[PDB]
Structure formats: C-alpha cells, structure tokens
Amino acid sequence: GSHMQTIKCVVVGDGAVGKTCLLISYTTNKFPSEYVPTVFDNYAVTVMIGGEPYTLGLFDTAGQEDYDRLRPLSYPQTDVFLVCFSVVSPSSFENVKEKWVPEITHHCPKTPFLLVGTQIDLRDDPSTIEKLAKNKQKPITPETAEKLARDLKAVKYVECSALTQKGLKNVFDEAILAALEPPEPKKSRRC
Amino acid sequence: EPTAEQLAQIAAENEEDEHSVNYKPPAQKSIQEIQELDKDDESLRKYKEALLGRVAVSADPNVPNVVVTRLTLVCSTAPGPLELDLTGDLESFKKQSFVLKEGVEYRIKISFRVNREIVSGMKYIQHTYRKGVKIDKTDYMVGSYGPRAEEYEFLTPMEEAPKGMLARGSYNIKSRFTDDDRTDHLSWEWNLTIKKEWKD
Ligand SMILES: Nc1nc2c(ncn2[C@@H]2O[C@H](COP(=O)(O)OP(=O)(O)O)[C@@H](O)[C@H]2O)c(=O)[nH]1
Ligand SMILES: *C/C=C(\C)CC/C=C(\C)CC/C=C(\C)CCC=C(C)C
Ligand SMILES: [Mg+2]
Ligand SMILES: [Mg+2]
C-alpha cells in the first residue's frame, strides 16, 4: 500500500505551563507523579487516524527567554505547532498573543497550529481559584479561548488535563488532522 | 504590444500584508554561551545535543558563518538544469538569459552551509523588476540552523509561473540572504526571461 507519512508536531508555550507533562502523559498514559524533566526527549509514535498509520513525532521546547535563539532550531519542517497555555494562569494566556504565535508564524509561515488549554481540572479547584479571583483574574473558558484562536487564525482551540487525561488523546488527534489539511496557496503571482 | 507602464497597477500585492504583531529578534547569544547555561540539567543537555549535534568546526578566519552554495530551480518540466553558483564571480549573472516557461509550477532549492554559530531566522528576499519598476516583493523564510560539516538544502513551496499572453518579458532580479540580525550574508542581481516555450 502507501508509504507511512510522518507528522512533525512541535509544542510551544511559556515555562511550567505543562508542555512536558502533557507529552509524557500522552505517551505512557501515566501522569508524572514524582519526576518531571525540563524537556521531554524527541519521540515517535504510530497513531491510527481515519484508518491510516501515521508516525507522530513529538517535540517539547525550552520556552525560556534564555533559549529564544536555540528553540527555533527545531522549527524547520514542522507540520503542526501546539501553542499551550494554562487555564489558571493568565500570564501564559497573554504571552500566547505576544510571544508565541508571532514566533511560530515568523519562522513557519504556512504552518497550522492550535491553542491548548492545559490543566482543565484547575478550572474548578480551591487553592488555585483562591489566588485568582483575588488579584482580579478568573479562569479561561472555551468561549474566551475560541475567540483568541479565531482571531489568531488557529485551526482550532482544544483543552485538556495531563492530570485527568481528559481531552489529551484528542489534542493529538486534532493535531494530526490539522497537519493533513492542504496548504491553500493564496500566493497568486499572476495578475 | 508586450508591456507599457501598467506595471504600477500590477503592484496589487506589494506592502499591506505586514499587519502583524512584530516578532522581536532574539538576543545575540552564542553556542558556547548556550552550552554553559544549564550544565546541571541532564534533560536540557540532551536537548542542546539533538539540536546542536557535536564537534566539527573547521576554518575560522577566512570562512564566514553562512555560505550559500547555490540556488537550484526544481522543475519536472524543465529539460535543462537551472542553477546559480553563488560562489565567487557574481557579475556573470548580469548578462545571462535565464528562460522559464510560462504557467509552470516550480520551486526553489536553496543550498547553504552554516559554519560557526547559529543563523537565526534566515530568509531569502527576492525583488522582481520590469523596466526598472519593482513589481513584486517576496520573502521565503528558511529558518534558524546550527553549524555542521554537511550542507543544508531548503525547498520553497510550489508556486506557479505567470501567463505570457501579456507579461512574457525579461526581468531584473535583485536578491539577498539576510536574517533576524540584519546581517547581509549575500546580495546579487540577475536577469530572468519568461517565454511561451522551453528553450525557444
Ligand atoms: N494539577 C496539575 N498539575 C500539572 C498538570 N500538568 C503539569 N502539572 C504540574 O505543573 C508544573 C509545570 O508543568 P510542566 O509540564 O513541567 O511545564 P512546562 O515548563 O510547560 O513543561 C509541574 O509541577 C507539574 O507537575 C496538570 O494537568 N494538573
Ligand atoms: C504579475 C507578475 C508578473 C506579470 C511577473 C513577476 C515575475 C515573477 C514574480 C518571477 C519569479 C521568478 C523566480 C522566483 C525565479 C526562479 C529561478 C531560479 C531560482 C533559477
Ligand atoms: Mg514514498
Ligand atoms: Mg518543558
């Protein structure tokens, strides 16, 4: 039959937002209890979608300002980006529009991407909501995110919890589908 | 009648496609500096190793950080090869007859080589002139790359060639390879010609 296609998926976002845990959670199914590395190693997994095998290559990033020069070295040839932000952390959600999207659209023009709401379990949690509603800041909602996503022209908006694995398997399933959709030129040189 | 001064109307593209919250170039750090930032973190060292590879750094004096070798026109319909040796004499390109059949889909194969440091967000800017008039601005992002012995080969997306029923003339092309640091690695000019047939 046909050759197995590879999908290169790159995950971006600020520090501690959950890029790493989301990846180990997805590839082992077990959330990282004790140990959690700065960066998850480059990894590949066969994923079945619409009846076809796909080698999904996963790429975790070092989102610190110290690595704004190193990080893009993984960007070339990317098929899809996953810009992530914690729901109980507006600081990241903001940085999405400021740093992230421009960084990826700068380096990979016609490359699709999705917005990822990490830690959805915290949308409803004591201690976290505690410090939130205090400093005039409340948890993000699908409606809120979908607005920013469409504004940013993100293929879609998806959310999940690396803790409760709710929506995880789905994030990568949409990641795959998002990467399969044809380019669409829009670069008409004729006049 | 091939062309007039209706070239200015062709600028129904030009600059207006900017409208974006600007990127912001990254600091001018360096490999050795990158290498010493978090030696304590095993995970990060694995991360730098995958991206930066390991060892092999030759000529430091004479050789610059980036050195584009050539630009190749990848086309299945093109009978004869189309390249440009971006090494040495460039004035030669100011008197060549580069034919490109109209309407054909094609793409560019950029062949460069990084030597010492990182090249952050390297791009290929192409300016198409007809009768001295700039009728097209185009940016092809190549991205950031690390130093290595083996050369890199980047391919631009598939694009279509214009239909000659009108603009089938000869153009003056100005090109350069810059980056996020405004460094001008290379700059040259050459002439291209559209026609109705391949090598007519
Ligand atoms: N409750 C909770 N904590 C999480 C989840 N994901 C990551 N964390 C914790 O959040 C912190 C930072 O997440 P991490 O994935 O390392 O962030 P990264 O810098 O984006 O990789 C760690 O202390 C994790 O244990 C989650 O889904 N629920
Ligand atoms: C409406 C535009 C018209 C009428 C003409 C503009 C001409 C273009 C845009 C030509 C592009 C030529 C390229 C990209 C050259 C590629 C050839 C090599 C890389 C050998
Ligand atoms: Mg094949
Ligand atoms: Mg991480």
XYZ file of C-alpha atoms and ligand atoms in Angstrom:
441
model
C 0.000 0.000 0.000
C 1.042 3.622 0.504
C 4.066 4.777 2.455
C 3.746 5.771 6.081
C 3.644 9.521 6.427
C 5.323 11.342 9.333
C 3.782 14.254 11.165
C 6.177 16.553 12.956
C 4.336 18.119 15.939
C 6.063 20.953 17.895
C 4.706 22.090 21.269
C 5.271 25.683 22.368
C 4.394 27.781 25.394
C 5.868 29.530 28.442
C 7.556 27.780 31.337
C 5.706 25.498 33.740
C 2.576 25.699 31.547
C 2.571 21.914 31.139
C 4.117 21.136 27.737
C 6.294 18.382 29.163
C 3.723 16.634 31.390
C 1.200 16.662 28.572
C 3.674 14.686 26.421
C 4.662 12.007 28.964
C 1.022 11.697 29.895
C 0.185 11.043 26.254
C 2.987 8.589 25.503
C 2.930 6.486 28.706
C -0.622 7.267 29.844
C 0.688 7.805 33.359
C 0.945 11.408 34.601
C 4.406 12.226 36.066
C 3.996 11.838 39.856
C 7.490 12.442 41.216
C 9.907 13.338 38.405
C 9.263 15.814 35.585
C 12.135 16.763 33.206
C 12.720 20.231 31.815
C 12.392 18.797 28.334
C 10.813 15.573 27.053
C 13.073 13.747 24.535
C 12.191 13.693 20.809
C 9.814 10.795 20.430
C 7.860 8.964 17.722
C 4.588 7.008 17.921
C 2.393 5.329 15.336
C -1.104 6.794 15.506
C -4.193 5.492 13.760
C -6.472 8.153 12.257
C -9.246 7.645 9.743
C -7.929 4.139 9.075
C -4.343 5.152 8.289
C -0.999 4.744 10.123
C 0.931 7.967 10.901
C 4.243 8.379 12.657
C 3.664 11.232 15.085
C 6.959 12.847 16.102
C 6.718 14.827 19.347
C 8.848 17.907 20.170
C 8.927 19.553 23.606
C 10.506 23.009 23.929
C 12.572 25.151 26.326
C 10.353 28.218 26.449
C 12.672 30.462 28.484
C 13.936 33.780 27.159
C 17.419 32.287 27.548
C 16.555 29.966 24.677
C 14.855 32.236 22.136
C 17.806 31.588 19.840
C 18.126 27.818 20.366
C 14.438 26.890 20.352
C 13.694 27.736 16.688
C 16.303 25.169 15.582
C 13.583 22.559 15.786
C 11.030 24.568 13.809
C 12.164 23.786 10.245
C 9.939 21.107 8.575
C 7.291 21.268 11.269
C 3.818 20.041 10.287
C 1.888 21.413 13.246
C 2.505 23.546 16.301
C 0.673 23.259 19.607
C 0.779 26.580 21.406
C -0.170 25.829 25.016
C -1.402 27.909 27.959
C -2.594 27.073 31.482
C -6.227 27.943 32.254
C -5.442 29.034 35.813
C -2.590 31.256 34.627
C -3.463 34.382 32.554
C 0.227 35.315 32.361
C 0.716 32.475 29.870
C -2.581 33.064 28.063
C -1.447 36.632 27.350
C 2.047 35.592 26.227
C 0.280 33.470 23.610
C -0.611 36.548 21.539
C 2.535 38.491 22.424
C 5.367 35.985 22.041
C 4.286 32.552 20.851
C 2.086 32.971 17.791
C 4.370 35.629 16.321
C 7.436 33.446 16.954
C 5.916 30.469 15.072
C 4.274 32.475 12.262
C 7.569 34.265 11.851
C 9.557 31.041 11.395
C 6.914 28.824 9.792
C 4.587 30.971 7.611
C 2.114 28.472 6.180
C 2.296 26.031 9.139
C -1.003 25.372 11.003
C -1.302 25.399 14.773
C -3.775 25.002 17.646
C -4.233 26.603 21.048
C -4.028 24.307 24.020
C -5.667 24.867 27.377
C -3.558 22.866 29.799
C -4.795 21.906 33.271
C -8.582 21.998 32.866
C -9.007 20.238 36.195
C -7.967 23.508 37.816
C -10.856 25.394 36.208
C -12.526 24.202 39.428
C -10.013 23.919 42.299
C -9.801 25.518 45.802
C -6.237 26.857 46.265
C -5.809 27.895 42.614
C -9.093 29.821 42.228
C -8.236 31.321 45.618
C -5.251 33.389 44.426
C -7.001 34.038 41.110
C -10.285 35.822 41.845
C -8.235 37.784 44.393
C -5.836 39.618 42.048
C -8.697 40.381 39.601
C -8.192 37.306 37.391
C -10.522 34.418 36.594
C -10.140 31.051 34.737
C -10.365 30.956 30.928
C -13.360 29.428 29.139
C -13.670 27.631 25.766
C -15.648 30.650 24.508
C -12.869 33.029 25.593
C -10.124 30.918 24.008
C -12.069 30.232 20.782
C -12.230 33.997 20.261
C -8.448 34.440 20.545
C -7.856 31.346 18.418
C -10.057 32.519 15.533
C -8.514 35.973 15.911
C -5.054 34.404 15.695
C -6.370 32.148 12.905
C -5.649 28.927 14.778
C -7.041 25.837 13.116
C -8.928 25.310 16.389
C -8.915 25.521 20.155
C -8.697 22.415 22.324
C -8.078 21.888 26.006
C -7.118 19.077 28.302
C -5.592 17.974 31.575
C -2.363 15.984 31.697
C -3.611 15.004 35.136
C -7.050 13.658 34.261
C -6.085 12.933 30.638
C -9.397 14.470 29.643
C -9.084 15.557 26.021
C -5.418 14.521 25.732
C -5.766 11.730 23.134
C -7.984 14.197 21.272
C -5.443 17.072 21.208
C -3.038 14.958 19.177
C -5.831 13.546 17.036
C -6.716 17.117 16.034
C -3.004 17.850 15.740
C -2.754 15.071 13.148
C -5.854 16.154 11.230
C -4.716 19.806 11.384
C -1.439 18.746 9.722
C -3.174 16.786 6.972
C -5.162 19.728 5.612
C -3.614 21.095 2.363
C -1.722 24.454 2.301
C -4.041 26.621 0.156
C -1.670 28.877 -1.917
C -3.211 32.359 -1.648
C 0.138 33.451 -3.124
C -1.174 34.359 -6.587
C 1.721 35.751 -8.631
C -0.364 36.183 -11.808
C -2.199 39.461 -12.401
C 2.197 45.064 -27.699
C 4.022 43.329 -24.790
C 4.218 45.900 -21.979
C 3.601 49.566 -21.141
C 3.694 51.455 -17.833
C 0.737 49.491 -16.474
C 3.422 47.857 -14.304
C 2.488 50.112 -11.393
C -1.033 48.648 -11.435
C 0.491 45.156 -11.103
C 1.518 46.225 -7.586
C -1.836 44.826 -6.429
C 0.206 42.944 -3.811
C 3.238 44.919 -2.550
C 3.239 46.062 1.099
C -0.021 45.890 3.089
C 0.398 42.230 4.062
C 2.593 43.203 7.034
C -0.158 43.907 9.619
C 1.134 41.619 12.366
C 2.302 41.990 15.967
C 6.049 42.023 15.281
C 8.174 39.053 16.283
C 11.128 40.604 18.219
C 14.595 39.243 17.328
C 16.279 37.026 19.926
C 19.353 38.235 21.834
C 22.710 37.644 20.165
C 23.794 34.766 22.416
C 26.235 32.095 21.223
C 26.752 28.328 21.138
C 29.412 28.214 23.865
C 27.183 30.509 25.935
C 24.211 28.234 25.225
C 26.360 25.266 26.185
C 27.087 26.707 29.655
C 23.595 27.995 30.588
C 22.323 24.915 32.456
C 25.006 22.210 32.624
C 23.175 20.884 35.688
C 20.122 19.888 33.658
C 20.598 16.476 32.023
C 17.349 16.941 30.076
C 18.495 20.289 28.647
C 21.899 18.904 27.607
C 20.113 16.165 25.634
C 18.004 18.954 24.148
C 21.002 21.018 23.040
C 22.744 17.899 21.743
C 19.833 16.913 19.480
C 19.682 20.434 18.038
C 23.410 21.302 18.035
C 24.866 17.893 17.240
C 28.523 17.587 18.243
C 32.037 18.829 17.371
C 33.443 19.559 13.861
C 34.387 23.228 13.342
C 36.938 23.991 10.600
C 38.185 27.287 9.087
C 37.596 30.196 11.470
C 39.448 33.104 9.763
C 38.603 33.143 6.041
C 35.197 31.462 6.311
C 32.100 33.459 7.441
C 29.241 31.894 9.437
C 26.963 31.362 6.451
C 27.974 30.495 2.907
C 25.275 29.889 0.322
C 26.497 27.492 -2.316
C 23.690 27.663 -4.844
C 20.076 28.233 -5.782
C 18.534 25.485 -7.886
C 15.276 25.547 -9.799
C 13.477 22.289 -9.165
C 11.182 21.625 -12.103
C 9.960 18.358 -13.601
C 9.033 20.024 -16.902
C 12.352 21.868 -17.305
C 14.628 19.920 -19.723
C 17.864 21.749 -18.913
C 19.143 22.332 -15.309
C 18.810 25.801 -13.755
C 21.387 26.729 -11.126
C 23.389 29.739 -9.934
C 26.860 29.209 -8.393
C 26.686 31.778 -5.594
C 30.424 31.225 -5.154
C 32.997 33.693 -6.481
C 32.128 35.843 -9.515
C 28.568 37.167 -9.414
C 28.809 39.766 -12.197
C 28.363 36.912 -14.682
C 24.690 36.752 -13.703
C 24.266 40.298 -15.046
C 24.373 39.049 -18.643
C 22.695 35.620 -18.680
C 19.491 34.517 -20.400
C 17.535 32.504 -17.835
C 14.414 31.206 -19.559
C 11.420 29.986 -17.551
C 8.385 28.635 -19.406
C 5.109 30.357 -18.507
C 2.462 28.812 -16.242
C 4.700 26.034 -14.926
C 4.605 25.074 -11.245
C 8.042 25.209 -9.678
C 10.075 25.565 -6.517
C 13.461 26.794 -5.292
C 16.194 24.622 -3.788
C 18.403 26.769 -1.563
C 21.770 25.202 -0.722
C 23.734 26.851 2.080
C 26.186 25.909 4.823
C 26.470 27.133 8.417
C 30.000 27.173 9.780
C 30.426 28.508 13.295
C 27.392 29.907 15.083
C 23.599 29.884 14.822
C 21.798 31.665 11.992
C 18.543 32.924 13.482
C 15.551 33.086 11.132
C 17.444 33.301 7.841
C 15.346 34.490 4.904
C 15.584 34.871 1.143
C 14.313 38.168 -0.187
C 13.603 38.473 -3.904
C 12.758 41.681 -5.796
C 11.385 41.385 -9.318
C 11.950 44.384 -11.608
C 10.476 45.025 -15.081
C 11.755 48.137 -16.875
C 13.292 49.314 -13.605
C 9.995 49.047 -11.753
C 9.688 46.854 -8.647
C 6.505 44.896 -9.320
C 6.970 42.175 -6.695
C 8.256 41.714 -3.143
C 8.752 38.135 -1.863
C 10.023 36.594 1.364
C 10.961 32.913 1.740
C 11.724 32.042 5.370
C 14.347 29.322 5.701
C 14.531 29.411 9.490
C 17.238 29.064 12.128
C 20.023 26.496 11.699
C 23.067 25.166 13.506
C 26.682 24.693 12.320
C 27.706 21.438 10.640
C 30.001 19.912 8.014
C 27.239 18.747 5.673
C 25.359 21.375 3.675
C 21.648 22.097 4.085
C 19.109 22.023 1.225
C 15.897 24.002 1.746
C 12.947 23.922 -0.711
C 10.372 26.674 -1.095
C 6.685 25.908 -1.610
C 5.347 25.071 -5.066
C 4.449 28.257 -6.992
C 3.049 28.845 -10.483
C 4.756 30.839 -13.248
C 2.876 33.830 -14.801
C 0.993 33.526 -18.108
C 2.891 35.081 -21.012
C -0.088 36.365 -23.049
C 0.921 39.712 -21.542
C 3.946 39.794 -19.219
C 6.306 37.419 -21.012
C 9.212 39.870 -20.890
C 12.643 39.986 -19.259
C 13.168 40.896 -15.597
C 15.976 42.247 -13.439
C 16.099 40.320 -10.188
C 17.759 41.573 -7.038
C 18.237 39.089 -4.198
C 19.894 38.798 -0.807
C 20.166 36.448 2.175
C 19.724 38.193 5.499
C 18.385 37.191 8.937
C 16.966 38.311 12.295
C 20.247 40.148 12.976
C 20.050 42.154 9.709
C 23.356 40.554 8.706
C 23.691 40.504 4.940
C 25.230 37.187 4.059
C 24.929 37.688 0.321
C 23.475 40.032 -2.295
C 23.454 39.874 -6.079
C 21.459 40.596 -9.228
C 20.496 38.533 -12.235
C 18.138 38.554 -15.180
C 15.240 36.193 -15.883
C 13.124 35.797 -19.004
C 9.656 34.324 -19.472
C 8.702 32.771 -22.824
C 5.948 30.663 -24.391
C 8.166 27.589 -24.822
C 11.066 25.851 -23.041
C 14.300 26.982 -24.723
C 12.671 28.648 -27.747
N -2.570 19.705 38.770
C -1.763 19.639 37.728
N -0.535 19.907 37.603
C 0.061 19.754 36.422
C -0.538 19.297 35.189
N 0.465 19.320 34.317
C 1.755 19.734 34.693
N 1.349 19.991 36.099
C 2.365 20.490 37.035
O 2.761 21.859 36.569
C 4.231 22.142 36.711
C 4.815 22.534 35.417
O 4.404 21.735 34.267
P 5.394 21.226 33.173
O 4.697 20.231 32.303
O 6.775 20.816 33.663
O 5.620 22.662 32.379
P 6.445 23.021 31.100
O 7.627 24.079 31.526
O 5.474 23.735 30.216
O 6.958 21.779 30.696
C 4.758 20.783 37.311
O 4.877 20.995 38.760
C 3.689 19.686 37.046
O 3.595 18.569 37.944
C -1.904 19.010 35.386
O -2.583 18.573 34.306
N -2.552 19.149 36.556
C 2.038 39.743 -12.066
C 3.503 39.352 -12.090
C 4.224 39.340 -13.229
C 3.490 39.740 -14.500
C 5.712 38.933 -13.205
C 6.528 38.731 -11.932
C 7.637 37.715 -12.130
C 7.906 36.852 -11.128
C 7.031 37.008 -9.882
C 9.061 35.836 -11.382
C 9.656 34.948 -10.283
C 10.970 34.313 -10.693
C 11.655 33.486 -9.865
C 11.046 33.213 -8.491
C 12.977 32.854 -10.313
C 13.365 31.408 -10.011
C 14.507 30.948 -10.892
C 15.593 30.386 -10.324
C 15.565 30.268 -8.796
C 16.700 29.954 -11.318
Mg 7.370 7.431 -0.600
Mg 9.138 21.516 29.299
